[PDB]
Coordinates of C-alpha atoms in Angstrom, one line a residue:
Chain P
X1 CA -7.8 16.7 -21.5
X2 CA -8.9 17.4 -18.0
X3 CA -10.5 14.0 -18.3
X4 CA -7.8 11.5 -17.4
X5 CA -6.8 13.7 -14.7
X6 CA -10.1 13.9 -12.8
X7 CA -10.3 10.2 -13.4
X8 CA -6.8 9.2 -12.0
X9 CA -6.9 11.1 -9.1
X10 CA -10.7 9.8 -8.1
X11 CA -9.6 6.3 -8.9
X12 CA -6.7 7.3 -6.0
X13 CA -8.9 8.5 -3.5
X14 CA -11.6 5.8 -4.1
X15 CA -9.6 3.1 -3.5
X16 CA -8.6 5.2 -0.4
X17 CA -11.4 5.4 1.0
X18 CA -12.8 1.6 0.0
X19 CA -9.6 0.4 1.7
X20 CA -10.0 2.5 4.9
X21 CA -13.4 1.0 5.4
X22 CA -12.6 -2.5 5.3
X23 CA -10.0 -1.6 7.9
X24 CA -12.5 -0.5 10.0
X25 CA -14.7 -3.3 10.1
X26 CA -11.7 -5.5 10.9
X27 CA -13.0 -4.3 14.2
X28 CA -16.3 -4.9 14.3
X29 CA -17.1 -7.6 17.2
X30 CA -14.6 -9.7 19.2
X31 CA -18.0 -10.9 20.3
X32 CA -19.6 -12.7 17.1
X33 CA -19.1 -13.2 13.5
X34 CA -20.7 -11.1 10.9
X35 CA -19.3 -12.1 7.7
X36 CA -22.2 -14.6 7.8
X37 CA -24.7 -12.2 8.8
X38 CA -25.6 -9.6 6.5
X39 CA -23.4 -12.0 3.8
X40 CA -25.8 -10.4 1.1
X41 CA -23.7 -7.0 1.3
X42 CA -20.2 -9.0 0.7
X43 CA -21.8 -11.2 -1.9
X44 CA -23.0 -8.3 -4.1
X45 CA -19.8 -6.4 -3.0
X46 CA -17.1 -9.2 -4.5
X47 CA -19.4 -8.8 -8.0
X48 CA -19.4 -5.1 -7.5
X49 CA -15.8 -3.9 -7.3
X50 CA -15.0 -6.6 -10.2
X51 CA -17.6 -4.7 -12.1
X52 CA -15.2 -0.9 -11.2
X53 CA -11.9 -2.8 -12.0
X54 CA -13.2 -4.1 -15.0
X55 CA -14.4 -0.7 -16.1
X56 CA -10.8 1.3 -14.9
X57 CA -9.3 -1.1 -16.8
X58 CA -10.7 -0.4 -20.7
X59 CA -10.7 3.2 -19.5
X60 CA -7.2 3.4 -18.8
X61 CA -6.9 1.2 -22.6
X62 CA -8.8 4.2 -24.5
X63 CA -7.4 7.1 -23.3
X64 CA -4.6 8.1 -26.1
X65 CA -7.5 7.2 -28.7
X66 CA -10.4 9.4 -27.8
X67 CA -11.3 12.4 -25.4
X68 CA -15.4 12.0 -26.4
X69 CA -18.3 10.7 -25.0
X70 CA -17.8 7.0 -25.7
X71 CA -14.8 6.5 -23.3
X72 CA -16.6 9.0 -20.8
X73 CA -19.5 7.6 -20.2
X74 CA -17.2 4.4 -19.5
X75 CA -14.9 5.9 -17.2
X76 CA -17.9 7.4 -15.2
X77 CA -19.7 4.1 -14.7
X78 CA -16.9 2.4 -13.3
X79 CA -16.6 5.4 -11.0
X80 CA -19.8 4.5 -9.8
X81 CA -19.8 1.1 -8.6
X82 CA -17.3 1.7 -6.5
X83 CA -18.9 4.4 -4.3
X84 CA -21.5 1.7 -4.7
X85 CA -19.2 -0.7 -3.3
X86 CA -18.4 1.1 -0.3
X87 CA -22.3 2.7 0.5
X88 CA -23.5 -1.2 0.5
X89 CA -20.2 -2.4 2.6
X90 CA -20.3 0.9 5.3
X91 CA -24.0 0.4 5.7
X92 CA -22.8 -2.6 8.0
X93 CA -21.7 -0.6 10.5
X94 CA -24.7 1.1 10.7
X95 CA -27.8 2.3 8.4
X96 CA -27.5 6.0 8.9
X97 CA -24.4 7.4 6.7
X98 CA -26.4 4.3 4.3
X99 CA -29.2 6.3 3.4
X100 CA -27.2 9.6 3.3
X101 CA -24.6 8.3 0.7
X102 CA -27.3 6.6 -1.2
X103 CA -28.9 10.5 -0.9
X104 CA -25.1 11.7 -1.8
X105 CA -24.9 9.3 -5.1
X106 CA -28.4 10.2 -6.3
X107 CA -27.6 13.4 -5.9
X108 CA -24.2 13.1 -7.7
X109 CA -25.4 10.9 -11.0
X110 CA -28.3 13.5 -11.1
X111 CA -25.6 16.7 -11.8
X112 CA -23.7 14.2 -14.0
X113 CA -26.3 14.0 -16.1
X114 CA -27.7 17.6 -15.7
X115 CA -24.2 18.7 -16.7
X116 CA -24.7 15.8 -19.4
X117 CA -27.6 17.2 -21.0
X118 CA -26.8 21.0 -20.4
X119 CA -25.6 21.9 -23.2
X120 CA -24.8 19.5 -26.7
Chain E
X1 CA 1.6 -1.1 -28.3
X2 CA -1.4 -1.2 -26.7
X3 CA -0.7 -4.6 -24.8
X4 CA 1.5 -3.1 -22.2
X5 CA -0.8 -0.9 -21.0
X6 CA -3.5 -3.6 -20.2
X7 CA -1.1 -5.7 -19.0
X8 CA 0.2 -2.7 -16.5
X9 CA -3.6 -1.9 -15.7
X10 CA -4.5 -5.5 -15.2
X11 CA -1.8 -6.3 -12.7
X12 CA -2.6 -3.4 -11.2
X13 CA -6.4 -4.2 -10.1
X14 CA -6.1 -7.9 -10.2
X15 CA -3.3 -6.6 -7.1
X16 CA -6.1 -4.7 -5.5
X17 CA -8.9 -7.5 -5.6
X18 CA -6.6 -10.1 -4.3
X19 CA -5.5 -8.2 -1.6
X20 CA -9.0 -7.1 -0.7
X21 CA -9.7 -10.8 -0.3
X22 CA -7.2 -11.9 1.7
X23 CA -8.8 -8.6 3.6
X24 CA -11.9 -10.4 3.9
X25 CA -10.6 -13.5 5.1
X26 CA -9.0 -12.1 8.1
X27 CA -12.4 -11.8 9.2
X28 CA -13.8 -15.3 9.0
X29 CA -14.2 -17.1 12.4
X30 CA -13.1 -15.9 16.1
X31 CA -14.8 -19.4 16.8
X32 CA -12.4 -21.8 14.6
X33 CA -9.8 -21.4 13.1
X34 CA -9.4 -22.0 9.1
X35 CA -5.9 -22.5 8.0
X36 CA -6.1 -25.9 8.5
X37 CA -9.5 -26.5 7.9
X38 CA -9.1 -25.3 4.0
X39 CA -5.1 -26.2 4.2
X40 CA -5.4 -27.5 0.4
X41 CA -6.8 -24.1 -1.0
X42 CA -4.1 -21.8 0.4
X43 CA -1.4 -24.5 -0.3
X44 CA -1.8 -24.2 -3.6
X45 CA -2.4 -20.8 -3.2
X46 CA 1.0 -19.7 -2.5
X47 CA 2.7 -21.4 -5.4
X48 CA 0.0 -20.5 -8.0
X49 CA 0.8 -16.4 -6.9
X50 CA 4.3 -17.2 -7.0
X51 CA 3.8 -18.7 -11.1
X52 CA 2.3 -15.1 -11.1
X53 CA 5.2 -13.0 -9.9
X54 CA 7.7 -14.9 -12.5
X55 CA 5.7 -14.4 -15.3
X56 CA 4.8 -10.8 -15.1
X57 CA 9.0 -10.9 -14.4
X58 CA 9.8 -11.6 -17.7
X59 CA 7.1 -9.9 -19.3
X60 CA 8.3 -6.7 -18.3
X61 CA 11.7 -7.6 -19.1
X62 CA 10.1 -8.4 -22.4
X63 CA 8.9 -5.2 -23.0
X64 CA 10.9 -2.9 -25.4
X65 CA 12.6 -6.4 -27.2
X66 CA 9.4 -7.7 -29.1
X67 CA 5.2 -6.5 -29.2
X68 CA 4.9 -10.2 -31.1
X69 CA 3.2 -13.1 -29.8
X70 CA 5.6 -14.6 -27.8
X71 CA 5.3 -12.2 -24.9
X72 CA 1.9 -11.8 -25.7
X73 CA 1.7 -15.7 -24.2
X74 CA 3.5 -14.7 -21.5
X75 CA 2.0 -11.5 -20.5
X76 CA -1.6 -13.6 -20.6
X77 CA -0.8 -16.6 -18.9
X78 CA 0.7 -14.7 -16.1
X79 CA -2.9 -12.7 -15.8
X80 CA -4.6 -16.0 -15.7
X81 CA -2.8 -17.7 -12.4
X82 CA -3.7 -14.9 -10.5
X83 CA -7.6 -14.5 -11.2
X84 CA -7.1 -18.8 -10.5
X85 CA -5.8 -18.1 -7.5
X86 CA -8.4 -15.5 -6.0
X87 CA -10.4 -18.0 -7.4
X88 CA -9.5 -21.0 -5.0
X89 CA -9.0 -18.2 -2.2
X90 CA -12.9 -17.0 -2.2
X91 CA -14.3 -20.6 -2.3
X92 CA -14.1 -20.6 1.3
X93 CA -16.1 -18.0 1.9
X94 CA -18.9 -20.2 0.0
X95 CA -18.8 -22.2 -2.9
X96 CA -21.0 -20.2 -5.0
X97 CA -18.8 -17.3 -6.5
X98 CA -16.7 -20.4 -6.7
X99 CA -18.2 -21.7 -9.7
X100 CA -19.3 -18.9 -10.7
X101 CA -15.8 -17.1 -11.1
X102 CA -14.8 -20.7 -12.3
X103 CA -17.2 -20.0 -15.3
X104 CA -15.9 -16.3 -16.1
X105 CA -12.1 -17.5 -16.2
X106 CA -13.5 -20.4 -18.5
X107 CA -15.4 -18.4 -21.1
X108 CA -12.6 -15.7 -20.4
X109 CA -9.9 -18.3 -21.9
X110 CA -12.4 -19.2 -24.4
X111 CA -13.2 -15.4 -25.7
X112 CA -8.9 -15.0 -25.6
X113 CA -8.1 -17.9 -28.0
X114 CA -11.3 -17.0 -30.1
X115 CA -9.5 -13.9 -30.7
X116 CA -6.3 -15.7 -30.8
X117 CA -7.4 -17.7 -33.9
X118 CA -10.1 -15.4 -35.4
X119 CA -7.3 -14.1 -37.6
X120 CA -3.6 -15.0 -38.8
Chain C
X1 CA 20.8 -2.1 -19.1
X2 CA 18.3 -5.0 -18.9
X3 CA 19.6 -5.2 -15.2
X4 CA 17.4 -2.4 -13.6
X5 CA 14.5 -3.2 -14.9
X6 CA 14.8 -7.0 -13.7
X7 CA 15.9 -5.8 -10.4
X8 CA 12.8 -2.8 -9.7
X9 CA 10.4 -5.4 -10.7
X10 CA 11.4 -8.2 -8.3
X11 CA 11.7 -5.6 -5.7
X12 CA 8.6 -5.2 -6.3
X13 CA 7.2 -8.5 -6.5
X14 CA 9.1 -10.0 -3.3
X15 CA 7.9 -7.0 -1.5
X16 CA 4.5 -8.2 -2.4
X17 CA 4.3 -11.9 -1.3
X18 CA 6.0 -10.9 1.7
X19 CA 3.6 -8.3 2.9
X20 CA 0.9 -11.6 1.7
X21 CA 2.7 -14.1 4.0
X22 CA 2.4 -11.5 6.9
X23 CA -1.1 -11.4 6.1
X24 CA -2.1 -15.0 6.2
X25 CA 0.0 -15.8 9.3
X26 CA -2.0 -12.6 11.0
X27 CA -4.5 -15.8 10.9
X28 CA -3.0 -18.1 12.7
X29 CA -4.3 -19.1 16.2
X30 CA -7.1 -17.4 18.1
X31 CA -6.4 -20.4 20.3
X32 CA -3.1 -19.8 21.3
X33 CA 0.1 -17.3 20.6
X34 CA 2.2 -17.9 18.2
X35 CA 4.7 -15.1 18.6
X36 CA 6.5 -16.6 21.6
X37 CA 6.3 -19.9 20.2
X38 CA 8.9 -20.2 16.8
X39 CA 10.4 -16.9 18.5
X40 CA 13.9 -17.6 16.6
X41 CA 12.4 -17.0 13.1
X42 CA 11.2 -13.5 13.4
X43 CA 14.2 -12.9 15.6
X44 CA 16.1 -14.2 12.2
X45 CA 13.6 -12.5 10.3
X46 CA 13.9 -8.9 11.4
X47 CA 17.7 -8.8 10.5
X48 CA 17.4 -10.4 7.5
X49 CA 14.7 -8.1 5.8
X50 CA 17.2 -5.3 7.8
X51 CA 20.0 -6.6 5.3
X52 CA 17.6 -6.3 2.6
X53 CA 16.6 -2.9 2.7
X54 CA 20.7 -1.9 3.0
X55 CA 21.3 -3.6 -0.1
X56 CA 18.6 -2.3 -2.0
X57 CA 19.9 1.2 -1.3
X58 CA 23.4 1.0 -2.6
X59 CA 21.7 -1.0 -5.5
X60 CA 19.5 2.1 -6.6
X61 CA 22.6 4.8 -6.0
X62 CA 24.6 2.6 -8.3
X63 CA 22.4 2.5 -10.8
X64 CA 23.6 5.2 -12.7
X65 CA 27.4 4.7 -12.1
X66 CA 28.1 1.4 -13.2
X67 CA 25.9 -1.6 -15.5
X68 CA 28.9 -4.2 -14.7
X69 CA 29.5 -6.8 -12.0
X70 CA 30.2 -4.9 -9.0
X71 CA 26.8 -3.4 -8.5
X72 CA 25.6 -6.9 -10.2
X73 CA 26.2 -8.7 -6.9
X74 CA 25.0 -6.4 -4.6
X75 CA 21.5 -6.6 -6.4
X76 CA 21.5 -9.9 -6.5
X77 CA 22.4 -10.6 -3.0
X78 CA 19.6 -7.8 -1.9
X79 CA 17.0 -10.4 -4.1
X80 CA 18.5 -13.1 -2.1
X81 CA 18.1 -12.5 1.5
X82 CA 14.5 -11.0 0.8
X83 CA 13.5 -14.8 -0.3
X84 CA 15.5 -16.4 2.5
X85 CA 12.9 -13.9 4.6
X86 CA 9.8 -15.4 3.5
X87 CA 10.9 -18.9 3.5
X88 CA 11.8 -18.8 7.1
X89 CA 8.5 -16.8 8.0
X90 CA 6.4 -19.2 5.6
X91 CA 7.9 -22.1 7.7
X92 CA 5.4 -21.7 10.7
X93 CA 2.6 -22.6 9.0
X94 CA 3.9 -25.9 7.9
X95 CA 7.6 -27.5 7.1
X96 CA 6.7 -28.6 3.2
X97 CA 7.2 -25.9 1.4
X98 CA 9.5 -24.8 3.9
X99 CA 12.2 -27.7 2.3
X100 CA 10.5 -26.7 -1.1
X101 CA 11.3 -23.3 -1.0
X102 CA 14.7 -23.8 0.6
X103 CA 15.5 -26.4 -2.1
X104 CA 14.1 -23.8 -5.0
X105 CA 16.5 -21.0 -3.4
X106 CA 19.2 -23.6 -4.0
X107 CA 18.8 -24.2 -7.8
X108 CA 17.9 -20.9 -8.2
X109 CA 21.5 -19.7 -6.6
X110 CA 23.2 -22.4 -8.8
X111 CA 21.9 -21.5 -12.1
X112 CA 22.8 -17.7 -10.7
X113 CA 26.3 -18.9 -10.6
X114 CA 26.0 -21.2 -13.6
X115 CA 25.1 -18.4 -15.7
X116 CA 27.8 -15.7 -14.0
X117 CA 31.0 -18.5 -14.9
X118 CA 29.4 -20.1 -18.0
X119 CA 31.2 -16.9 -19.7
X120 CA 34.3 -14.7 -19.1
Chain Y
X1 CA 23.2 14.6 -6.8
X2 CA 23.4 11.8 -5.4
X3 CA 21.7 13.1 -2.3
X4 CA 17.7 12.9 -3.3
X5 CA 18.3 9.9 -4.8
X6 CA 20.0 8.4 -1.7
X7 CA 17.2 9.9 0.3
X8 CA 14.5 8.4 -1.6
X9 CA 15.1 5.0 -1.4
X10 CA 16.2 5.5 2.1
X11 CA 12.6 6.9 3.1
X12 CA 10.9 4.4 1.0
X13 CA 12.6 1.3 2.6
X14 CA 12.4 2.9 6.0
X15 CA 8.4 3.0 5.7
X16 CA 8.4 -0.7 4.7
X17 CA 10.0 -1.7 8.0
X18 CA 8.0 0.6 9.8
X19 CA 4.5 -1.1 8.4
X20 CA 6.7 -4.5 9.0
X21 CA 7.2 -4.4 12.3
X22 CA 3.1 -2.7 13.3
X23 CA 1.9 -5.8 10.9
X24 CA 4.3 -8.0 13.6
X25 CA 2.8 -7.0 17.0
X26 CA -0.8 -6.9 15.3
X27 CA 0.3 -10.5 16.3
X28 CA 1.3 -10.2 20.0
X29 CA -1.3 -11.8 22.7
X30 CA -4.5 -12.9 22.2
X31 CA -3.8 -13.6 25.7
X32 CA -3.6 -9.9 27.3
X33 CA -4.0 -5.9 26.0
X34 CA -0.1 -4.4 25.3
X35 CA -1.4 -1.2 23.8
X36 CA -2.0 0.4 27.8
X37 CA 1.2 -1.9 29.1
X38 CA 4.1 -0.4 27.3
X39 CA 2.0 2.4 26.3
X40 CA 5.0 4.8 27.0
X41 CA 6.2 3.5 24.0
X42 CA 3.6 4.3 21.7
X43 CA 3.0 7.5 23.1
X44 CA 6.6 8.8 22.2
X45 CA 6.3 7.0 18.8
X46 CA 3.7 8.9 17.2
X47 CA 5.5 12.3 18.2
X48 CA 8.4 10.6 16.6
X49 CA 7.3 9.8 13.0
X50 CA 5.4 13.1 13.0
X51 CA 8.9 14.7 13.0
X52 CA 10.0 12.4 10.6
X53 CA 7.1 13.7 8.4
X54 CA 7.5 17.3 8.7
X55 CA 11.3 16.8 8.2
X56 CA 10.8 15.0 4.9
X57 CA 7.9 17.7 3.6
X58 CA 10.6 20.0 3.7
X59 CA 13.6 18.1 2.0
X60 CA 11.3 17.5 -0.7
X61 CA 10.3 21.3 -0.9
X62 CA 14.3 22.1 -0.8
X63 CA 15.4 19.3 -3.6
X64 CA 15.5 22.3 -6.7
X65 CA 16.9 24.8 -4.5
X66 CA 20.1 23.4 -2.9
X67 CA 22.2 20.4 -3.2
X68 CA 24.3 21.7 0.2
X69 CA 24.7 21.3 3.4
X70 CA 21.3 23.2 4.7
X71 CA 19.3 20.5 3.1
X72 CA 21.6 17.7 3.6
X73 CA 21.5 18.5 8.0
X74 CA 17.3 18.3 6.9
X75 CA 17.0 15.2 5.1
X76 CA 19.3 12.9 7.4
X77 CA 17.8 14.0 10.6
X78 CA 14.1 13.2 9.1
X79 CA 15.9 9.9 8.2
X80 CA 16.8 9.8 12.2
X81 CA 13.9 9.7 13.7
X82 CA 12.1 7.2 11.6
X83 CA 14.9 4.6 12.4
X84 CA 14.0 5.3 16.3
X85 CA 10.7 5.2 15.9
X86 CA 11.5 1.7 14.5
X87 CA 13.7 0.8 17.6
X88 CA 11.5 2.1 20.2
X89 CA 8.4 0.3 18.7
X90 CA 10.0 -3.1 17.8
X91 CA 11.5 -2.9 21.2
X92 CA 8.1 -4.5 22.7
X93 CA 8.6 -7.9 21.5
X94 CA 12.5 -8.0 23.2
X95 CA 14.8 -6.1 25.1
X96 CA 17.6 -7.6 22.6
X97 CA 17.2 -6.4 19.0
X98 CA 16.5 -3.2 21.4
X99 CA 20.0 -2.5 22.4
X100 CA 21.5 -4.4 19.4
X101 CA 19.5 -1.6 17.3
X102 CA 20.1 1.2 19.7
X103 CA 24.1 0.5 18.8
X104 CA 23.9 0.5 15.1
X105 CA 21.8 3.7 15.5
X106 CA 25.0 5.2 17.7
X107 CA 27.7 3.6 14.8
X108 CA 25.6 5.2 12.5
X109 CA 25.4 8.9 13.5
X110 CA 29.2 8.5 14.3
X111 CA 29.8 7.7 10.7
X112 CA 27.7 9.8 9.3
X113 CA 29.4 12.8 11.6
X114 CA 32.6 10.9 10.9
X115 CA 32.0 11.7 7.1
X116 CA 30.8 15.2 7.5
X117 CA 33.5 16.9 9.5
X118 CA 36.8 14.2 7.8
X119 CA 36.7 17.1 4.7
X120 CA 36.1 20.6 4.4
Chain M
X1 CA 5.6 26.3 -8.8
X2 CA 6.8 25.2 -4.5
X3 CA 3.1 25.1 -4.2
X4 CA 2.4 21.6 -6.0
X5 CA 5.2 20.1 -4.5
X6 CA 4.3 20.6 -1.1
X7 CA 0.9 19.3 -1.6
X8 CA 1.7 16.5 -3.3
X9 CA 4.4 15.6 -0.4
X10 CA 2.1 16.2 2.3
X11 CA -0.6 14.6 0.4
X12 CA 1.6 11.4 0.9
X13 CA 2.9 12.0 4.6
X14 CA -0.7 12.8 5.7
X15 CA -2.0 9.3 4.2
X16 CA 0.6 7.6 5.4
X17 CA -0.6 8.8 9.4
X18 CA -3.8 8.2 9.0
X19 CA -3.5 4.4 8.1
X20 CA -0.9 4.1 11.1
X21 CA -3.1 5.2 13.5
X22 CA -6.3 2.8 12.3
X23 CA -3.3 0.2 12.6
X24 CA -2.7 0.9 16.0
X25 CA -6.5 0.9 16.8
X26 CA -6.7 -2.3 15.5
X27 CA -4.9 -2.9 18.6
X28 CA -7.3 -1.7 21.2
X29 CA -9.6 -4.3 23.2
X30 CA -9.6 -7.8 23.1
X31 CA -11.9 -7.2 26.3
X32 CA -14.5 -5.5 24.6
X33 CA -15.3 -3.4 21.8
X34 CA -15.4 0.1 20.9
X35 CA -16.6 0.6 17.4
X36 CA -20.4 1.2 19.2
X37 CA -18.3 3.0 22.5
X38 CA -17.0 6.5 20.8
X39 CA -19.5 6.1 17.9
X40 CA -19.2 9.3 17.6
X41 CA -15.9 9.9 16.6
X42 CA -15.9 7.5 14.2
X43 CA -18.9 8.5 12.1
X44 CA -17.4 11.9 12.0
X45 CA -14.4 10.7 10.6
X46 CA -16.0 9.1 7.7
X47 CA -17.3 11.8 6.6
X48 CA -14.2 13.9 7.4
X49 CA -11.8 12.6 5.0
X50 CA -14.3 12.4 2.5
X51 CA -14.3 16.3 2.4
X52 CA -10.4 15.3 2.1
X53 CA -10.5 13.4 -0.5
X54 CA -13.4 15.5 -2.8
X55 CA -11.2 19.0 -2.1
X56 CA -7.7 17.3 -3.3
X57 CA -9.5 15.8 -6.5
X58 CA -10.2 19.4 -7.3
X59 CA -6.8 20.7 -6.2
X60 CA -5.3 18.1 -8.7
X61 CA -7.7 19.3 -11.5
X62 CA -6.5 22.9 -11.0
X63 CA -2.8 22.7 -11.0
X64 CA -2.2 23.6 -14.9
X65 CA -4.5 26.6 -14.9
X66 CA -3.4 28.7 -11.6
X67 CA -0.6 28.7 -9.3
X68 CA -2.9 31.7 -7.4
X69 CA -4.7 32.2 -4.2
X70 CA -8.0 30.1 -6.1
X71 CA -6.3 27.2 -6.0
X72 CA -4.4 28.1 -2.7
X73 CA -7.3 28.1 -0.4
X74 CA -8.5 24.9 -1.8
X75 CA -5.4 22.2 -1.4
X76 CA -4.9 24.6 2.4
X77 CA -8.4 23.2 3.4
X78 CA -8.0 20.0 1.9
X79 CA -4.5 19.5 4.1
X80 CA -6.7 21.0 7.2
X81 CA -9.6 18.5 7.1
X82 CA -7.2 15.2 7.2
X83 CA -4.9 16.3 10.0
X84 CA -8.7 16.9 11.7
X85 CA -9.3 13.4 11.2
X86 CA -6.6 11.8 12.6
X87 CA -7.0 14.3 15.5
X88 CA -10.4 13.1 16.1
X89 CA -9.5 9.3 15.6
X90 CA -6.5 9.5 17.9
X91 CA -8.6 11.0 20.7
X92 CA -10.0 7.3 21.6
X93 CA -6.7 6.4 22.5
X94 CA -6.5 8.8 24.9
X95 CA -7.3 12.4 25.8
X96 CA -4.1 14.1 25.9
X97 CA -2.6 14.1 22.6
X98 CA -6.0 14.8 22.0
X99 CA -5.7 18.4 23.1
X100 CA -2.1 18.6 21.9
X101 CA -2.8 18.4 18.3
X102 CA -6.2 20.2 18.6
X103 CA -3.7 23.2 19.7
X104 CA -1.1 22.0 16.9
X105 CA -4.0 22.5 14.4
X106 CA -4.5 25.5 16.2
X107 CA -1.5 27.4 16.0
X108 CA -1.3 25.6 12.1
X109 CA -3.6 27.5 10.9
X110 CA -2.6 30.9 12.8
X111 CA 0.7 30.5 10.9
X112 CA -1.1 29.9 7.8
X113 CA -3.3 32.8 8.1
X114 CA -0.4 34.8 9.7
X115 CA 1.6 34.6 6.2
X116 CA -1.6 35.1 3.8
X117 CA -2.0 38.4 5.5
X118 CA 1.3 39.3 6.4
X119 CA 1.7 40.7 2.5
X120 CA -0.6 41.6 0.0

């Protein structure tokens, strides 16, 4: 039953943090545009975040029915693409903390899986 | 009993996405200005968001009275002005994810009455 | 015991477009200020949201006290000024749905009266 | 009982107007910088909600405990300083809704004394 | 049983600072920009309430199994690393509250440390 839990409170603090970043780069340059410029990361990121509310959303639907594998392998995607979401939008700002999140999410699908396959 | 809780979910994120939109906007040009370049989309904006707020209204006041079809009209109809209105809102970013989201909420309409009439 | 219900969830829902408005008109002019100019309807504006809150708050101690008339009025005046709010701000960005909204606020008081004398 | 109840609406409202009125002068000059002129202001405004934090942590940790007058001192002084935080902060745009707030502040502690010391 | 209570309210009081104070930096220079000035800070504070967010997810997952020390020193930390944040953030504004709140923090955590010990 831990499950919804873990999943409620990380939805929380994801759209937290996703939130937080955009505020940021509300203050990017008084000097030019850049919502034209690197356009590729907001194009994917629209797509992206449709892709986590999307996912929440059947999620939050199957939780009374089943505690197994099937809704948590659903649940765990759609906590993906949102740290997705927010690696792709931060990298904008600069390409450092980009490769060290990418780093940080490799990492963190590798123990999913490891704790995944750990045991039946 | 199942449909309140996607409804509840899907006001939820469909909240968060439009929000995060308008978001974007606010950083569109410091050269021009938009609003009234683009006048017609957020014109019709307002009033299509506001056909949103009165029909999730009555849905919830619909709640505990009847799980029937009825407010099952209700409850959907409400979710669709919203998506619309993102919808229109993004297109002036570019017109791509314009048709493109035109397309989902199409075949999304067309997958609801399918399962609308698929049975008695 | 209907009443709540309708009221939380329009609290909710004006509270939402009016937070939206803010947000557009935070896109207004990066050619001139806008603040100084149409000073009088924020003046208005403050005071009126002020008038707002204070209702709300008697409205939720009452909840518990009383379904009848007496908190019925206060509630519904609280819903009104919140409204009156927006159309005022909304006004700036153009004087259509300005009369519109002003003229939907009217019907929308009269069939609040209709319905409160069509029965003892 | 009516106390927490009173109190929570009260700090719920009371943080809308405070985001209210920061969403307002986001919209001040693109002419000049206000954030060094006036910057007296702002300075004493963040030590001022912080009390009204701290003071609200603790009601909440003192709701089970005691419906009495400990609390009650607690809770309305964290309710204080958020409504001055408000005054000071709005006080930027005009002198007028300054004073005019500065009284109703007054009015209201004498009330609110007015209540407390009228009955054993 | 205080012990989830005050973490959750401070939880909320905490958040609520920290997007005030990236409000109020959204009010810095329409002369020039300092997102690439202070980089430092910044790209600290990313990471900063990340550690936030990660250690409450945990606290929340451990409140059914132990009220104890366990869980204790997790949510303490958790509360540290946000205050941290805004400390950090706050410093571009200027230098003084800076060193205030360092020493706040300070003396916080010599309180905190004060009382763990003080008993066994």
């Amino acid at each position: 039953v831990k499950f919804t839990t873990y999943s409620a409170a990380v939805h929380k603090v994801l759209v937290m943090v996703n939130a937080g970043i955009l505020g940021l780069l509300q203050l990017v340059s008084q000097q030019s545009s850049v919502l034209e410029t690197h356009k590729a990361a907001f194009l994917c990121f629209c797509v992206f975040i449709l892709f986590y509310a999307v996912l929440r959303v059947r999620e939050a639907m199957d939780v009374r029915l089943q505690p197994g594998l099937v809704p948590r392998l659903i649940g765990h995607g759609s906590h993906l693409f949102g740290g997705l979401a927010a690696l792709v939008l931060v990298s904008v700002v600069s390409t450092a903390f980009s490769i060290v999140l990418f780093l940080l999410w490799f990492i963190w699908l590798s123990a999913v899986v490891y704790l995944e396959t750990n045991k039946p």
